[PDB]
């Protein structure tokens, strides 16, 4: 049914467990670069501009 | 309403983008004027001549 309390509990793990992200084509050692997750309330995934 | 980047415009190439936009303003700038004649309840002969 989806709940409000669930969100609050899962704010804790996000800092403790990272995310590994890549493109559809990857060739370098610059593909599988991984990032620490941070809380956001928006569908489309925000990131750095350098990487 | 929308905001674009000016950074793609010189890398790959569009001048039509520039022209359409400045003409879009030009089209709607004349458009903004013509409403006022009707927004003030003026009308009669003048609207035609503009």
């Amino acid at each position: 049914r989806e709940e409000a309390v669930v969100w609050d509990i899962l704010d804790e793990v996000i800092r403790e467990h990272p995310v590994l992200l890549n493109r559809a084509p990857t060739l370098h050692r610059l593909g599988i670069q991984a990032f620490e997750p941070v809380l956001i309330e928006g569908k489309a995934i925000q990131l750095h501009p350098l990487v | 309403d929308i905001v674009l980047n000016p950074l793609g415009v010189p890398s790959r190439m569009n001048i039509g983008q520039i022209l359409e936009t400045h003409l879009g303003m030009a089209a709607k700038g004349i458009g903004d004027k013509i409403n006022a004649m009707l927004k003030q309840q003026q009308e009669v002969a003048k609207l035609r001549e503009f």
Binding site: A4, W7, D8, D11, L39, I40, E41, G42 | -
Partner: protein, 215 residues
């Protein structure tokens, strides 16, 4: 009610020394991190009453662009050393003071005649240095009262602000049954004779003073 909302709550301040400060704010609505944040930037710069150096008469020099006999620091350098010097005045409005100094040693800051209603906050300030032989300077300094900055170019430089630097940051935050809320993290630096709490409280009451008529 159906018109009321929830007001902000500070109580998360990173207090590092008397001079610098790093305040945070957990709750603020959409539209309200950017407002107040930017409004107070343009309050805490122009409208900040302090005390600073204005007009000065040199004993052996008339015009600024000269070089003194037996000193390393130029006048243009020393002008700026005087600008950053911090003063509090309670009783009077405007006072004329003197810098009687001579000998082998560094120019401190205390060696002024502590006049009537004059209180200085900082003693270790390097205004100048004196070199070989004895040397001697006796500056007839004058001070005025103001509100904002007035430079020398406009005067056909005074520094009337306790605020050194202003930087407000805006970042996202999470709360229970909500979408997005703008956290106001405010980075401030003061040195014009004012602790961070009093400045903001004054700026808030001065805003309140202006907004009293509006209400």
């Amino acid at each position: 009610s159906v018109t009321e909302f929830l007001k902000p709550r500070l109580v998360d301040i990173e207090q590092v020394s008397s001079t610098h400060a790093k305040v945070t704010l957990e709750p603020l609505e959409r539209g309200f991190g950017h407002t107040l944040g930017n409004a107070l930037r343009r309050i805490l710069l122009s409208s900040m009453p302090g005390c600073a150096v204005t007009e000065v008469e040199i004993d052996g020099v008339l015009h600024e662009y000269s070089t003194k006999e037996g000193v390393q620091e130029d006048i243009l350098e020393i002008l700026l050393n005087l600008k950053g010097l911090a003063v509090r005045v309670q009783g009077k409005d405007e006072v004329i003071l003197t810098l009687n100094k001579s000998g082998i040693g560094p120019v401190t800051a205390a060696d002024i005649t502590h006049d009537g209603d004059v209180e200085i906050v900082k003693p270790q300030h390097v205004i100048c240095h004196l070199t070989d032989e004895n040397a001697s300077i006796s500056m007839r300094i004058k001070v005025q009262r103001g509100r904002g900055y007035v430079p020398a170019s406009t005067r056909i430089d005074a520094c009337y602000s306790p605020v050194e630097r202003i930087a407000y940051n805006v970042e996202a935050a999470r709360v229970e049954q909500r979408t997005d809320l703008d956290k106001l993290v405010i980075e401030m630096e003061t040195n014009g004779t004012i602790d961070p709490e009093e400045a903001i409280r004054r700026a808030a009451t001065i805003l309140a003073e202006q907004l009293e008529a509006f209400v």
